[PDB]
Every structure is written in structure tokens, then in C-alpha cells.
Design a protein around this ligand. Structure first.
Ligand SMILES: *[C@@H]1O[C@H](CO)[C@@H](O[C@@H]2O[C@H](CO)[C@@H](O[C@@H]3O[C@H](CO)[C@@H](O)[C@H](O)[C@@H]3O)[C@H](O)[C@H]2NC(C)=O)[C@H](O)[C@H]1NC(C)=O
Ligand SMILES: *[C@@H]1O[C@H](CO)[C@@H](O[C@@H]2O[C@H](CO)[C@@H](O)[C@H](O)[C@H]2NC(C)=O)[C@H](O)[C@H]1NC(C)=O
Ligand SMILES: *[C@@H]1O[C@H](CO)[C@@H](O[C@@H]2O[C@H](CO)[C@@H](O)[C@H](O)[C@H]2NC(C)=O)[C@H](O)[C@H]1NC(C)=O
Ligand SMILES: *[C@@H]1O[C@H](CO)[C@@H](O[C@@H]2O[C@H](CO)[C@@H](O)[C@H](O)[C@H]2NC(C)=O)[C@H](O)[C@H]1NC(C)=O
Ligand code: NAG
Ligand code: NAG
Ligand code: NAG
Ligand code: NAG
Lengths: 195, 322, 183
């Protein structure tokens, strides 16, 4: 099903698409940036030399050198910011690989929705894609429960699981799966009285 | 708004600014990314559940008392009694002097609507334990759900039932002191206070900044033309448009730095609430000092507040071991 | 051009107690906003004319082209006043008072009809309002619905136990790097 899900809608890969869009977009606003005259006579460089005297063409050419020079710093500063968020997102991806893939994760809602089982990595352009496999409980049936039980004047508590009743007599079962078992001393332990 | 702030209300503003190219449309594309992100942060912290559960009318939770965190019917807003102190302790004509194109867009999620999300987390973590975050919700008694939590610590469940009355009174007395502790000292909410104070101060420095002359004969563009020849009046305004535009750049770069720190602190909250709230945490000193038991979220203006519940051993005695 | 000082704006009388000498009122803005007219001896307070930012709500271009316009932080009855020749930079003043205008906290939008049921958000607006292109066709505005309402029956001696399970595979995408650039 996951093969069709990717091929169904084209909006799945949005996070890996704007990464290449943003960097490609910032280059275009850099090439068009040199067209501005920056208050000078003309944006063309060499022509302003042959049109104006060298005594004061330095003033005209200076206001254009600074105009283009300031453009580069804004581009560089943008790259430092963008490189900061990508690196802050690669460490998260590295942490996922060391925990979800190489082992089983007890951190709830970290390696998928539900109880984690095991994962698979898949490569991608400028990114990685995981496939979390989880365990989701299905439909449920309610019962009647009691915290403990007292038989020989002493309270008994389950070893693992909880006491459930269906109307006639009680049972003990696991928390996450309904597998009723007959109440037994092996499944309980004794502590104190029942008053 | 670049056109109005820089040299707005001038027929010679736009044309002279037009030849500078695509500067303010570059900045405008950076302050919309911040605007969009600030709405996504709230969608990942509070909106992790879909079904809006509701608490039962009866409030007999095995002796426990939750009246100080559940929604209050008396107030028109569905806000608990703890949140009331939090709202009053954050002091959110200075808004009217923003005619220079410095607006403040409203958040997507209204204050009274986030309170519904918070009320769903509480009503899903006291009737369904923690299973509602990892599948279909499953009801369970509270006096029996706690015994599951004690089992995780390493203490057998037979001690909770024999001390249920003492623990119930001990927990109720602990929640009461939180109400007075927050109001007694105003430094508790210093984390939220500076978030809004820093932003407000940054705006004031920007508006006051345009009064400078930057080497021009005058600090006003309207009067700089009636006293100087129009042949080279472009020179003085050029020293002025560049300086005004340059300061706008500085303010934007500051916001980019701040937004990175908030996003870092937003994900940390989005991680605490997915583990300390929808489950039990074994990570030491992550959801509060001591062994972790359970946590409840509470809302606040531009932030979230947790109430961790922890188990701490009391006095001990020496012994001889083998 | 009061007192030989050029400017633009609307004029209203203010009650600020100007002393027999002081002629101008000023605040942090440091841009003239109050003039004592030399024509007579009253007090004038200047505020800039009403303005705002224009926001356009548009569905897919191939789907349609009818749009709903939102003005931020302005009274809804103020925008009909704007309909004059050579008063606005836009000339599309036809939308100023058209379909049923719905008032929101961030101004009032025009061209959209306000339903009172709820759906999921398609185009965010602000203050818990969203808009979409629904059915012959028009743009509608509603209030977000957080989710399907649900209730869990809580009793002090009942427990629910699953009797089955299911296995699901959930995907996830994370960027790891970007292009290397040299200048
Ligand atoms: C609650 O669960 C208990 C435990 O399973 C149920 O008691 C058991 O019910 C089964 C099914 O009716 C009984 O098996 C049948 O018993 C008849 C008796 O004549 C026998 O002829 C059949 O061949 C078959 O073995 C079983 O005996 C019975 N156990 C006891 C100790 O009574 C009980 O019915 C359940 N109650 C409800 C309301 O579901
Ligand atoms: C939970 O705690 C609240 C807080 O004390 C209790 O509300 C009090 O109720 C008594 C009974 O009349 C009043 O005298 C107090 O003034 C109330 N407190 C406040 C702050 O108004 C509430 O009764 C407790 N829940 C239960 C079930 O006892
Ligand atoms: C009994 O337990 C105490 C700790 O509760 C051990 O330490 C004594 O009590 C305090 C805590 O260090 C010190 O001031 C005493 O000097 C300690 N006693 C001694 C003799 O050093 C104490 O050692 C334990 N007793 C035994 C016999 O093991
Ligand atoms: C537990 O659920 C599974 C499906 O999630 C059930 O498996 C189906 O059982 C029906 C029985 O008529 C079959 O027709 C389907 O083909 C089964 N589906 C699959 C995917 O195998 C299963 O029966 C349920 N358990 C119980 C005890 O009913
Ligand atoms: C028009 O654009 C929509 C998406 O906005 C697209 O689904 C549709 O195929 C397009 N129609 C064309 C290009 O004819
Ligand atoms: C417009 O102003 C009036 C003033 O009486 C106010 O009652 C109303 O709510 C305002 N409406 C909008 C949309 O600003
Ligand atoms: C909801 O709107 C419909 C028409 O769109 C109207 O008939 C109905 O009375 C409204 N209900 C309210 C306002 O409660
Ligand atoms: C459950 O609550 C009801 C209502 O307060 C009460 O009558 C009943 O005794 C309680 N039973 C248990 C086992 O707590």
C-alpha cells in the first residue's frame, strides 16, 4: 500500500522539494541583483570608464562597488542560517537511525504512531525516508474488574496482568491481549490480609 | 511594508526606490516565512490528538482531587483555575504609532480554542490511562491505573492499595501549594516575559531609528527638496535611502536568529508532551527530578506549562548485606 | 503646509493644552502630527489617512479565478468610503461593497459568503477562520472544527481489553544535506 501512497499524491515529497527550491531561488535573486544601478549612471561597468573622466569616475564607480559587495554578504548570511537548520535536522535523522533501526525504541511516539517494532531506511535525493512498522490494538470488549482477591483471608494480587470477570467467575489475562487464564497461585502472590 | 516605511508618501519615492531592484521584496519573502512557521509550531505541540474527549460529570477519582486543573464552568472561557493566574501575570498607545507599515498579524489559533485542546489531553489521560495516544482509547479506573505506574518504577503494586488513603491526601496537598507558589514570586514566568519584551523593544528601536540624518542635510525627505537644487538632490537622498534600507536589513536578520532558538525550544516541548504526558519516561531528570509518574499540561500566553508528578524516597536505615 | 511645513493627512481638533508659546505636538514618532494653524488660534491634530494591506484569497487558477479580498485591521464600514475616482491606487473599487461582507478580528473580507457549519481548514485566514471553494460555485468561510467529538464512559470497576490487533507501516521524510556553492 505504501508504494501506491507515494504514487497517489505528489505532495508527499514537499520537504525534500523546497530544499532544492530555496537554494536555486536565492541564486536567481543574486544574478538579477547586479542589474541595479545603485544610484550610479549606468549598471554597465567598463562603459562608465570611457564616458567619464578618471578624476571623479572613482566616486561613481565606488558607489557601485559597495552596492554589489553588500549583495554578497546578504547571500552568505542566508547560507549560514540555512546550513544551521539542515545540520540541526541531520542530527535528528542520525539519532533515528541509531535507535529506531538498530534497536527497539521505548520512547513513545518517537519512531512511529503506536508501539514500535522495527524499521527500514530508504535513500532519497538530499534526504532519507524511513518505514516505521508498528502495532496497533484492534476492537475491544469491556469487562468488570477488581483490584485484588481474598480467598484464605489473605489478599492476592496478580503477578502480571489484571483480574477480569465475564459475569460468572473471574480470570487473569495480559493487559494488551485478551487471553483468559484460570486464577492460580502461580499467577498471584500473597501480601497481608483482606480488610 | 517597504514602500511606506522607507520614504512613503512621496511621488519621487517609488521611482527612485524602483531602480534599486528587488531589495525589499527579498526582505518581504523572509518575514512571511517567520509568519507561517509561528502557526505551525502550535499545530505540533497541542494538536497531537483528534477526538475531543470530555470528562464525566462525576468527579470521584478514587479519592484524588482534580478540581484545580479541570475546566471551570463558571468562567465563560474554558480555563482552569491554575491558568487564571498564568494569564494575569503576563502583561501583554504604542500600538497606535505603527502607521509606518509595521503591522502585527493575529495568530491562527484563538486563545479560547487552544484551551479545548488542552482540556482534551487531561480528559484522555485520567479516564483512559495512556493508551489513547497509541491506538483506540481504553477506559480504566484511576485507582488501578496508578498501580500500573508504580509497577514501572520498580515498586510492587501491593503498596499502593495499602497506602491509597495517604497518597490521595499527599497528592491533594501538593497541588494546592503550586497555586500559591506561582503568585508569590514573579520570576517564575521570566521565561515567557522576555519573549514578548524582546520583540516589543526591537520594534521601538526600528521606529526611532529613522530620525537619523545619515549625513544628509536634513532628516526629512519632504523638506530636503525645497532648500537644495534638484540637479544633485538625488545625492543626499541616496545617502538617506541606503541608510534607511540598511537598518531594515538588520532587524530582519535579528528575527531569523531568534526564530531558530524558538523552533529549537518548540520541538523540545513537542517531545516532552509526547513522552511525559502520553506515557511514562525512563529518561532520568527529563520529566522532573525523581522517578516520573505522570504529567499534566496547562496553557499559557505564548507557551506551555507542565505539572510533573514525581516519586521521591523518604528517610532510610542502615543495613548489613551479603 | 501649515507653518511652512509640507505634509499629507487629515485634520482634526485636539484638546492638548498647548502653552501660549508651544506650537507643535510631538511624540516618539518624530514625524510632524500636530500643527497650530497661523490662520486662527485653534489646535490641529494630524493623523495619516486610512490605509492597510491588501490580501487576496484565490483558489486554483485553472479551477476558477473568483477571489475574496481581505483588508487587515480596518472597520468594515470604512471601505465603502474608499470608493472614489483618484482616491485609491487600485481602481477595482467594485469589490469594496459587493457580496455579503463578513466581519472578522483581522478586518472584514469581501466576496465570500459565511456559512455557520464547520469543516477542516483549507486556506487559513486568522482568528480561527478558513476559506475554500465549495459548491453553482463560490468561496465560503467557516470556523475550524478541531475534530470529531467523542466521549469515554468512565466507571470505577470496569476495564476495556483488546481482543485483536493490526500491523501498519508509516512513512517519514527527513532532509539531510543541500548543494555546495562557490562564488
Ligand atoms: C463466563 O466464562 C465461564 C468460563 O468459560 C463460562 O463458564 C463455562 O461456560 C462454558 C460454555 O457454556 C461451559 O462449557 C460447556 O458446559 C456445558 C455444561 O453442561 C457442557 O455440557 C458443554 O459441553 C460445555 O463444556 C463450561 O462448563 C462453563 N464452566 C463453568 C465452570 O461453569 C460462563 O458461561 C461465562 N459466562 C458468560 C455469561 O459468558
Ligand atoms: C478539591 O479541592 C478544592 C479546593 O479546596 C475543594 O474546594 C473547596 O470546597 C470547600 C467545601 O465547601 C470550600 O469550603 C472551599 O472554599 C473550596 N476551595 C476553594 C479554593 O474554593 C474541593 O471541595 C475539593 N474536592 C473535593 C471532592 O472535596
Ligand atoms: C547507620 O546508618 C548511618 C546512616 O544513617 C551510618 O552513618 C552514621 O550516621 C551519620 C551519617 O553518616 C554519621 O554522622 C555517623 O557518624 C555514622 N555513624 C558512624 C558510626 O560512622 C552508620 O554508619 C550506620 N551504622 C552502622 C553500624 O552501619
Ligand atoms: C482479527 O482481525 C483480523 C483482521 O484484521 C481478522 O482476520 C480476518 O478474518 C476474516 C474472518 O472471516 C477473514 O475473512 C479475513 O480474510 C481476515 N483478514 C485477514 C487480513 O486475514 C481476524 O479474524 C480477527 N480475529 C478474530 C478472532 O476474529
Ligand atoms: C490547473 O492547476 C491544478 C492545480 O492547481 C491542476 O490540478 C490542474 O491539472 C491544472 N490544469 C491544467 C494545467 O490544465
Ligand atoms: C466598527 O466600529 C464600530 C464603532 O461603533 C464597532 O462597534 C464595530 O465593531 C467596528 N467594526 C469593525 C469591523 O471594525
Ligand atoms: C445558520 O445559517 C443559516 C443560513 O446559512 C440560517 O438559516 C441559520 O439560522 C443559521 N443558524 C444560526 C445562526 O444559528
Ligand atoms: C463507584 O462510584 C459510585 C458512585 O460514586 C459508588 O456508588 C460506588 O460505590 C463506587 N464503587 C467503587 C468500587 O469504587
Amino acid at each position: 500500500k505504501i508504494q501506491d501512497s507515494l504514487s497517489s499524491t505528489a505532495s508527499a515529497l514537499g520537504k525534500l522539494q523546497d530544499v532544492v527550491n530555496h537554494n536555486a531561488q536565492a541564486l536567481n535573486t543574486l544574478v538579477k541583483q547586479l542589474s541595479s544601478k545603485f544610484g550610479a549612471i549606468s549598471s554597465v561597468l567598463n562603459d562608465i570608464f570611457s564616458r567619464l573622466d578618471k578624476v571623479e569616475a572613482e566616486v561613481q564607480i565606488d558607489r557601485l562597488i559597495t552596492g554589489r559587495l553588500q549583495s554578497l554578504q546578504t547571500y552568505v548570511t542566508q547560507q549560514l542560517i540555512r546550513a544551521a537548520e539542515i545540520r540541526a535536522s541531520a542530527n535528528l535523522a542520525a539519532t533515528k537511525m541509531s535507535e529506531c533501526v538498530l534497536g527497539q525504541s521505548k520512547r513513545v511516539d518517537f519512531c512511529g504512531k503506536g508501539y514500535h517494532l522495527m524499521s527500514f531506511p530508504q535513500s532519497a535525493p538530499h534526504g532519507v525516508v524511513f518505514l516505521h512498522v508498528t502495532y496497533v490494538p484492534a476492537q475491544e470488549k469491556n469487562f468488570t474488574t477488581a483490584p485484588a482477591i481474598c480467598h484464605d483471608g489473605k489478599a492476592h494480587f496478580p503477578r502480571e496482568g489484571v483480574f477480569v470477570s465475564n459475569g460468572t467467575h473471574w480470570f487473569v489475562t495480559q493487559r494488551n491481549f485478551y487471553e483468559p487464564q484460570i486464577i492460580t497461585t502461580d499467577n498471584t502472590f500473597v501480601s497481608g490480609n483482606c480488610d | 511594508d517597504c514602500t511606506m516605511y522607507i520614504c512613503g508618501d512621496s511621488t519621487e519615492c517609488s521611482n527612485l526606490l524602483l531602480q534599486y531592484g528587488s531589495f525589499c521584496t527579498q526582505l518581504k519573502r523572509a518575514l512571511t516565512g517567520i509568519a507561517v512557521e509561528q502557526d505551525k509550531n502550535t499545530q505540533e505541540v497541542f494538536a497531537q490528538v483528534k477526538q475531543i474527549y470530555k470528562t464525566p460529570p462525576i468527579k470521584y477519582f478514587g479519592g484524588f482531587n482534580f478540581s484545580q486543573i479541570l475546566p471551570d464552568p463558571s468562567k465563560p472561557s474554558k480555563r482552569s483555575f491554575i491558568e487564571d493566574l498564568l494569564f494575569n501575570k503576563v502583561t501583554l498607545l504604542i500600538c497606535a504609532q505603527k502607521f509606518k507599515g509595521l503591522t502585527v498579524l493575529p495568530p491562527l489559533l484563538t486563545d479560547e480554542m487552544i484551551a479545548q485542546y488542552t482540556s482534551a489531553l487531561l480528559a484522555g489521560t485520567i479516564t483512559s490511562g495512556w493508551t489513547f495516544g497509541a491506538g483506540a482509547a481504553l477506559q480504566i479506573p484511576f485507582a488501578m491505573q496508578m498501580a500500573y505506574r508504580f509497577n514501572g518504577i520498580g515498586v510492587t503494586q501491593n503498596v499502593l492499595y495499602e497506602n491509597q488513603k495517604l497518597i490521595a491526601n499527599q497528592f491533594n496537598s501538593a497541588i494546592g501549594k503550586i497555586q500559591d507558589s506561582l503568585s508569590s514570586t514573579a520570576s517564575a514566568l521570566g521565561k515567557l516575559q522576555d519573549v514578548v519584551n524582546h520583540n516589543a523593544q526591537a520594534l521601538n528601536t526600528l521606529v526611532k531609528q529613522l530620525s537619523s540624518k545619515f549625513g544628509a542635510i536634513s532628516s526629512v525627505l519632504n523638506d530636503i527638496f525645497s532648500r537644495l537644487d534638484k540637479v544633485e538632490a538625488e545625492v543626499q537622498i541616496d545617502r538617506l535611502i541606503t541608510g534607511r534600507l540598511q537598518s531594515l536589513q538588520t532587524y530582519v536578520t535579528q528575527q531569523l536568529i531568534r526564530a531558530a532558538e524558538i523552533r529549537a525550544s518548540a520541538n523540545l516541548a513537542a517531545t516532552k508532551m509526547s513522552e511525559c504526558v502520553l506515557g511514562q519516561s525512563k529518561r532520568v531528570d527529563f520529566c522532573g527530578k525523581g522517578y516520573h509518574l505522570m504529567s499534566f499540561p496547562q496553557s499559557a500566553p505564548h507557551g506551555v506549562v507542565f505539572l510533573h508528578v514525581t516519586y521521591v524516597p523518604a528517610q532510610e536505615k542502615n543495613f548489613t548485606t551479603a | 503646509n501649515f507653518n511652512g511645513l509640507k505634509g499629507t493627512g487629515v485634520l482634526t481638533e485636539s484638546n492638548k493644552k498647548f502653552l501660549p508659546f508651544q506650537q507643535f505636538g510631538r511624540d516618539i514618532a518624530d514625524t510632524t502630527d500636530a500643527v497650530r494653524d497661523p490662520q486662527t488660534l485653534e489646535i490641529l491634530d494630524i493623523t495619516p489617512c486610512s490605509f492597510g494591506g491588501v490580501s487576496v484569497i484565490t483558489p486554483g487558477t485553472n479551477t476558477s479565478n473568483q477571489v475574496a479580498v481581505l483588508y487587515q485591521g480596518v472597520n468594515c464600514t470604512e471601505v465603502p468610503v474608499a470608493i472614489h475616482a483618484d482616491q485609491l491606487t487600485p481602481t477595482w473599487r467594485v469589490y469594496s461593497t459587493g457580496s455579503n461582507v463578513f466581519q472578522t478580528r483581522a478586518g472584514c473580507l469581501i466576496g465570500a459568503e459565511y456559512v455557520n457549519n464547520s469543516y477542516e481548514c483549507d486556506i487559513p485566514i486568522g482568528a480561527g477562520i478558513c476559506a475554500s471553494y465549495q459548491t453553482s460555485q463560490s468561496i465560503i468561510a467557516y470556523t475550524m472544527s478541531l475534530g470529531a467529538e467523542n466521549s469515554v464512559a468512565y466507571s470505577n470497576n470496569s476495564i476495556a481489553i483488546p481482543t485483536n490487533f493490526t500491523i501498519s507501516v508509516t512513512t517519514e521524510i527527513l532532509p539531510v544535506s543541500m548543494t555546495k556553492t562557490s562564488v
